[PDB]
Amino acid sequence: PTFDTMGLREDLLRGIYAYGFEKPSAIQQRAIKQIIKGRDVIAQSQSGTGKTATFSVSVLQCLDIQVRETQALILAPTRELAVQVQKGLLALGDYMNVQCHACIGGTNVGEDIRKLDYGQHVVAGTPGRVFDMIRRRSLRTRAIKMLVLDEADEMLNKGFKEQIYDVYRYLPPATQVVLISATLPHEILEMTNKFMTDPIRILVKRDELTLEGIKQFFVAVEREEWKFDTLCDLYDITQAVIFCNTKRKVDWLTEKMREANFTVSSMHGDMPQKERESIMKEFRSGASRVLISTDVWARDVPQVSLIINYDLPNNRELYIHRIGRSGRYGRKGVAVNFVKNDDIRVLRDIEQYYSTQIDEMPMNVA
């Protein structure tokens, strides 16, 4: 409930207050924090003050005015709505020497083709209109840090998946994606799987963590140190998280995992926040195939196709903090549990805690 806390630029910060924008909601602030941190955001939305301003602020912070080309591209379901966005952007940016434009085209498209050639930091328009001035080469794509899809419900669901995707193609890899929409139906939620990565999801209505999409297995190891040996067998390829219920295990397995050519990332709860943030930035970048850590942040979460419990958490409730789509929202995957002859009980009791089958590992990849 404050902008000043959020270390925004003062030229923008005046614009915010000058535009009249009341201190932002807990939720909005979260989105803004995260857009700025440079994460793909899905943000469920609601009729309320900062509806659009909330992301407009975000795009404006992350702008750099010296670079006089298009750095943010914001697509909306209509010319009209895109003009509102434009005007909003201007208003907030009126103390930033900001340059944006709504591709109305909207005869004259000539004035548009003129306006874009002449330098625009941000650019709004309908997924077509934009895709026009990409084909007509009026809009240079080269230095776009972020794509914003306003009212995705109204676009993504309702005939623009093509128009939008066409644009998407002509943009630098991994350009950042923010999907703002009041509604987020299942139809749209896969959509995002196709252009976002390990996205944050800020939804209005709460969402549990089911166990229901996840195939759970356990490797009867069953004395610690046949656990690494089996892990080694196991990975034979993409991204996965490996939990251990102690920092001592984490470090060991890491130094061993890295003896083996297995590019690794490690984490504790006993690390500062900017550290585990620092780490996960990399792990999410792809530059780590194998995140290993303590729970700490478990009750995390990086959307990951394969999770392994090298150790089984004594506290049962952890189990699904370590593992658990989603619940609507998110992705099925595989858990694998490494179980000491000693820890099979604990497995049975986790099994019973969640009222869930945990079958033995049959040697196959689905």
């Binding site: 998407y168 193609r169 002509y170 196709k194």
Partner: peptide, 9 residues
């Protein structure tokens, strides 16, 4: 899984 082919600076 969308890609950013058909692009080049």
């Amino acid at each position: 899984r969308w890609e950013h082919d058909k692009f080049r600076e």
